[PDB]
Amino acid sequence: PAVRISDGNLIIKNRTILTGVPDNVITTSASEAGPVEGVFVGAVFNKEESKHIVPIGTLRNSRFMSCFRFKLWWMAQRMGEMGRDIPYETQFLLVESNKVYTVFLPLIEGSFRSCLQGNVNDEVELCLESGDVDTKRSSFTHSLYIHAGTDPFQTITDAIRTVKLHLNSFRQRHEKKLPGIVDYFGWCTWDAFYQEVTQEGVEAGLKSLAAGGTPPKFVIIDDGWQSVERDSPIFRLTGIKENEKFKKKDDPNVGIKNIVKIAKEKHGLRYVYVWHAITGYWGGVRPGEEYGSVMKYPNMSKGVVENDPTWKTDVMTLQGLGLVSPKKVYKFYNELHSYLADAGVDGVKVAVQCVLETLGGGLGGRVELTRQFHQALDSSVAKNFPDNGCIACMSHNTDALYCSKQAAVIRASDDFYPRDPVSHTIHIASVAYNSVFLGEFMQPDWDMFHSVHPAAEYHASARAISGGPLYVSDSPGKHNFELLRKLVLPDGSILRARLPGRPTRDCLFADPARDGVSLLKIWNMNKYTGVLGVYNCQGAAWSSTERKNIFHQTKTDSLTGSIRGRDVHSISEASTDPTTWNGDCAVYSQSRGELIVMPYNVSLPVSLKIREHEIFTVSPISHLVDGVSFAPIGLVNMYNSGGAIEGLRYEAEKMKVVMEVKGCGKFGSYSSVKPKRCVVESNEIAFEYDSSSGLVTFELDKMPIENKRFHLIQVEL
Ligand SMILES: OC[C@@H]1O[C@@H](O[C@H]2[C@H](O)[C@@H](O)[C@@H](O)[C@H](O)[C@H]2O)[C@H](O)[C@H](O)[C@@H]1O
C-alpha cells in the first residue's frame, strides 16, 4: 500500500512518521486516474463551522523543514525535530526519515484553505478556514496531500503534479511562458526614489546605468506613478491614469506614454513594467459607482496575527480598503491595463496580493474572492500584456498559489532593505528555502538589490544563481560597474540559470540562519554546467518570541563546510554522456580564480565568515581518451560562468571540442593537456594555459557580430 494509516499510525514505506492519528481523520488514494502514490487526507466533524483545527498526528524525532508565513504576505524557513517546533501558518512541510522524504501539502478545498501548525504536545494540526463566517462546512476529504519518495526534489514535484491533477486550478512552473524580462538586466525605481519617483528620475537612472556599459533592457516604474488621494492616512486610487509626475512638462494630455517613448525610443529599453496593488492601491480604490468600490476592513486570522501581531494595528487594517466589486473587477483591471498597454507598457508588478484573503467576509471567503480577482487579473494580463507580463509580489499564500494558472514570476521573499543590516543574511536564506516550494509554481524573483552597498556582492552573486530576473534599484549615479559587469553583458543580457536556485540536499534540513554550524549551499544548472553558491548566513532569523527579524548570538564568526560535485543535484544532466560519465567535475571558484579537479565524492573545504559567500562553476569532465579530459567553464569573470555555453560537442575521433558561447570577456575551460589550437569563428587565437591546474583561457573580444548570437569555438587538443 505504501502510504497508510494502520493502528493509529501514519506509515510511510514501513516507517512511522506520525502516531496518535485520531479516529476522525479519513484518507484516500482514489482519483479520476485512479490510484495515487500518496494520500489525500481530510476529516469529518460534528459541527458545521467556518474554522476547524484537527490533529493529524503526533510528530517526534523526525527532522523537517517548513515554510511558514511570518507576515501575511511572505514566508520563511524553520527546521526542527518535534511537532511543537512547526510554526503557525506552515504551508509546506518536508519530513526526512533516518533516505525517505515525505511532503505534506496543505490544500484548498472548495471554499476552505488549510495550513499546518504545531502544538505543545507535538501534534501536527490541520487548520481549515474559509475566511467568512457565512461559509461553513463539516466534512473534508482532500485538504492535505502526503507523498513520499527517495529524491527530495522529485518528491515535491510529484506531489505538486498529483495536486494539480485533482484541482486543475494551476499549472506547474515548467508549463508557463516566462516573460522576456527574465533574459535581461533591469532597473526598478523603488529603492532609488520610493514614492517620490518622477519621469525625470526614471530617465536619469536609465541614462546612468547605460553610460557605464551595463544598459538595462527593462524597467519597473514602481509605487509612485499612480493617481492617489487621502480621504497618518492611507491613500486610495482616484483614477487609473498616472499622476502629475508622469505627464509631460508641456502637454498634460500626454501621460505615461511619454516616459515609455523616452525609455524605449531614446534609451533602447525593450520592456517597461509598472507597479499596482491587486486592490488598485494600498488603500484600495476610492468608493464609487464606477468599479463598485465599498469600504472593507481586513479580518484577522489567528495564525497570521500570532506570527505577525503588528498586522492588527497596520494602516490597511484600521483604515480599510475600497474593495472593487467582484462583479466589476475585470472591468477595473482591463481599463487600467488597456490604458497602460496602449501607452507601450509591457507588464505589471502586482503587489499586496494576500489582502484578498482577509476581505472575503460576506463574499464567499478567502479562497473564492482570491480565485475571482485572479481570474480577472489573468484575463486582463493575457489580453493587454501578451508577453505574460505579471510579476507576483506579496503573494505567498496558498489560496493564490493553488490558483496560479498563468503568471510565471513570483517574488520569493520579503524586500531588499538597504538600510536594515539584519535583513541581508535572512534574505538569502529565505529566498533559497522558499524557492523549494514557490519554484514548483513560478520562477522565483530574488528581488532588486544595490550595486554600491556593503552586501552588494552577497546579493548580486545570489541573484546570479537564482534563475530569476536580475535587476537593481540603484539611485542614479550610485553604481558599481565592476560588480555589474559580472552580471550583465554590454547588450543588457544576463547569464540566467535554468532552474530556481535552491538549497542542496544536505542543507534542506539544516537551518543555516540558526544552527551556528552550517554554511548554506545553493545549486542551480545551466545546459552544460552546474553552479554552486556558498553563503554564511548565520546570525539572524525571525524570532518566535520577539516575532520579528533579529540578530542573535553565534559562537564563531567563521564556519567550515565542504563542497562536492554531487551537491549540484542535477549535475548529470550537464554531462554530454551521462551513461559513460564517472562523476568527476571541474570546479572553478569565481572569486579565488582557481580551477580544481574533483573526483566523484571528494570533498573540498570551504571557510566563510558571516556575510561571506563563494561561487563555484561545476562542469562534468568528459574523458575523450586516456589522458585527454575536458570541461568547459565559461565566462570566468562573471558569476554564472557556465550560463554562457549554449552548445557543446566532443569529437574524440579528431581530439576536438566545439562550443557555442554567448557574450564576451575571458572564456575559460579545463583541459588536462595544452591545446594545440584555439579557434574562434574559423580564426586561430592566442591563449594561455596553466599547466598545473589545466585552466585554458582566452578573450572573446566583442559581442557576437550580427544577430548571429553565439561565438563558435573550436578547441583542438
Ligand atoms: O511600495 C513598494 C512595494 O511594496 C513592497 O512591499 C513591502 C512594503 O513596502 C513593506 O514595508 C511591508 O508592508 C511588506 O512586508 C513589504 O514586502 C513590495 O515588495 C515591492 O518592493 C513594492 O515596490
CA of 291 to the centre of ligand 1 (A): 25
Contact 93, 17 (CB under 8 A): no
Burial per residue of 567-595, b for 16 or more beta-carbon CB atoms within 10 angstroms, e otherwise: bbbebebbbeeeeebebbbbbbbbeeeeb
C-alpha span between 412 and 111 (Å, rounded): 26
Question: For residue 698, which phi and psi values (nearest 5 degrees)?
Answer: -150, 170
DSSP structural state of residue 67? E
Site to probe by mutation for ligand 1, drawn from 314, 316, 394 as the one with most ligand atoms within 8 Å of Cβ, is 394
Closest CA to 143 of 62, 64, 58, 44: 44
CATH class entry, domain 175-486: alpha beta
Q: Please name the helix (run of DSSP H) or strand (run of DSSP E) that holds residue 407, with its range, or none.
A: none
In sequence order, which residues have a C-beta less than 8 Å from that of residue 548 and are 6 or more positions away?
542
Question: For residue 663, which phi and psi values (nearest 5 degrees)?
Answer: 85, -155
Contact 609, 536 (CB under 8 A): yes
Contact 164, 403 (CB under 8 A): no
In sequence order, which residues have a C-beta less than 8 Å from that of residue 442 and are 6 or more positions away?
173, 176, 392, 404, 407, 408, 409, 410
> Ligand 1 — pocket residues by CB below 6 A?
71, 73, 190, 222-223, 275, 351, 393-394, 414-415
For 506, counting Cβ atoms within 10 Å of its Cβ (0-12 exposed, 13-18 middle, 19+ buried), the class is: middle
Evaluated on CA atoms 40, 45, 50, 55, the torsion sign reads negative
In sequence order, which residues have a C-beta less than 8 Å from that of residue 645 and are 6 or more positions away?
526, 527, 528, 529, 632, 634, 659, 660, 661
Q: How far is CA 211 from the centre of its chain?
A: 30
The partner residues of 649 in beta bridges, in order of sequence, read 658
Evaluated on CA atoms 360, 362, 367, 370, the torsion sign reads negative
Contact 132, 365 (CB under 8 A): yes
- Whether residue 303 is preceded by a cis peptide bond, meaning omega within 30 degrees of 0, is no
Closest CA to 531 of 511, 504, 513, 558: 504
Question: For residue 527, which phi and psi values (nearest 5 degrees)?
Answer: -65, -45
Give the position of cell 551513461: 579
Give the position of cell 474572492: 369
Contact 448, 178 (CB under 8 A): no
Cell of residue 174, nine digits: 515548467
For 314, counting Cβ atoms within 10 Å of its Cβ (0-12 exposed, 13-18 middle, 19+ buried), the class is: middle
C-alpha span between 115 and 526 (Å, rounded): 35
For 158, counting Cβ atoms within 10 Å of its Cβ (0-12 exposed, 13-18 middle, 19+ buried), the class is: middle
Obtained via which technique? X-ray
In sequence order, which residues have a C-beta less than 8 Å from that of residue 611 and are 6 or more positions away?
424, 425, 454, 455, 458, 536, 537
Cell of residue 468, nine digits: 530569476
C-alpha span between 64 and 267 (Å, rounded): 50
Strand ordering across the sheet containing 628-635: 622-625, 628-635, 665-671, 695-700, 688-690
C-alpha span between 132 and 139 (Å, rounded): 17
Contact 123, 54 (CB under 8 A): no
- Residue whose Cα lies nearest atom 11 of ligand 1: it is 415
Contact 532, 567 (CB under 8 A): yes
CA of 183 to the centre of ligand 1 (A): 24
Cα torsion at 222, 225, 228, 230 (round to 10°)?
A: 70
- Residue whose Cα lies nearest atom 4 of ligand 1: it is 351
Cα torsion at 570, 576, 580, 585 (round to 10°)?
A: -60
CA of 414 to the centre of ligand 1 (A): 8
CA of 230 to the centre of ligand 1 (A): 19
- Whether residue 384 is preceded by a cis peptide bond, meaning omega within 30 degrees of 0, is no
C-alpha span between 467 and 644 (Å, rounded): 14
- Helices 456-464, 423-438: inter-axial angle, 10-degree rounding: 10
In sequence order, which residues have a C-beta less than 8 Å from that of residue 500 and are 6 or more positions away?
173, 435, 438, 439, 443, 444, 466, 467, 468, 524
Give the position of cell 544532466: 573
C-alpha span between 641 and 633 (Å, rounded): 6
* Number of residues that this document lists for the chain: 717
- Residue whose Cα lies nearest atom 14 of ligand 1: it is 414
Cell of residue 263, nine digits: 525609455
Cell of residue 678, nine digits: 584555439
Residue 223 alpha carbon, nearest atom of ligand 1: 1
CA of 462 to the centre of ligand 1 (A): 20
CA of 281 to the centre of ligand 1 (A): 12
CA of 126 to the centre of ligand 1 (A): 30
Residue 52 vs residues 5, 359, 493: alpha-carbon distances, Å: 21, 19, 50
